[PDB]
Design a protein around this ligand. Structure first.
Ligand SMILES: OC[C@H]1O[C@@](CO)(O[C@H]2O[C@H](CO)[C@@H](O)[C@H](O)[C@H]2O)[C@@H](O)[C@@H]1O
Ligand code: BTE
Ligand code: BTE
Lengths: 144, 140
């Protein structure tokens, strides 16, 4: 469970936003990519696996994940890819925040990173609670 | 401090790699960009700050760090602007550069290897373990 991420795509303004959610914390990483190809998807997974200890990804089983490049990436990084496993702990939420910052950014992808910043820093559960960024480091830390 | 990063660039096969090192842990994030621009730097910093608690970035004097889009991004994200890993990362990049068609793939394989690599014997830690242990400790 600390090694499990759910990957999902969302489309806005004709563009593709690939999102990785750390299931146990709600923490997200995201990128805007030109189309859902094997190469972009593999590169996105490789980057994520280099930044956090990714043991398992649940995907929507879209055709980008059935590509050979994506399989080679997961094997190289030691990720187990589980296609078609539902999200059970977000795209609605990211879009609402993107709407709150959209008029401050000349380009969508800047707005998407602003929204990821706001999501990951936001304290959940009233004033004594913790943000998704706080939660992920507390769950992953091995030697506190 | 847990919030202190150092950023810089390195040049290879005609491309620019932007590297950020979390100074207290040695953990890195890196991206290959077409050219070292103000827009690319700004976007890089915003991504970094959404992913980790970034207070201060130490940079070189380049005009890409001082553009008005970089200042807007830093004001918005709360970032205040003001060694060897460039050289270590480079080393690893050559070590795997053949397992990959594209430079940007080899760069991210190198980031992966660097962040996962246990330093010392049994009892040691990787850079990824140090940064999470540092921040988690700071949070309590
Ligand atoms: O969204 C494009 C944006 O991302 C950057 C990295 O900072 O480009 C890299 O990451 C993208 C998302 O994974 C990839 O599509 C791209 O191929 C990769 O180089 C920026 O340079 C770019 O503006
Ligand atoms: N990664 C993190 C740790 C502690 C707080 C944070 N806010 S955003 N990312 C965070
Ligand atoms: N962010 C991280 C925490 C623990 C181990 C890791 N390896 S790569 N990034 C990591």
């Amino acid at each position: 469970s600390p090694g499990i991420w759910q990957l999902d795509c969302t489309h806005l303004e004709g563009k593709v936003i690939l999102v990785a959610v750390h299931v146990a914390s709600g923490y997200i990483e995201a990128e805007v990519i030109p189309a859902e190809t094997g190469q972009e998807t593999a590169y996105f997974l490789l980057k994520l696996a280099g930044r956090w200890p990714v043991k398992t990804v649940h995907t929507d089983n879209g055709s980008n994940f059935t590509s050979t490049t994506v399989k080679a990436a997961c094997d190289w990084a030691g990720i187990k890819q589980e296609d078609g496993i539902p999200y059970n702990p977000m795209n609605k939420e990211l879009k609402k925040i993107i709407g709150q910052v959209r008029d401050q950014a000349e380009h969508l992808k800047t707005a998407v990173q602003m929204a990821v910043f706001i999501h990951n820093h936001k304290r959940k559960g009233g004033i004594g609670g913790y943000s998704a960024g706080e939660r992920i480091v507390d769950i992953i830390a091995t030697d506190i």
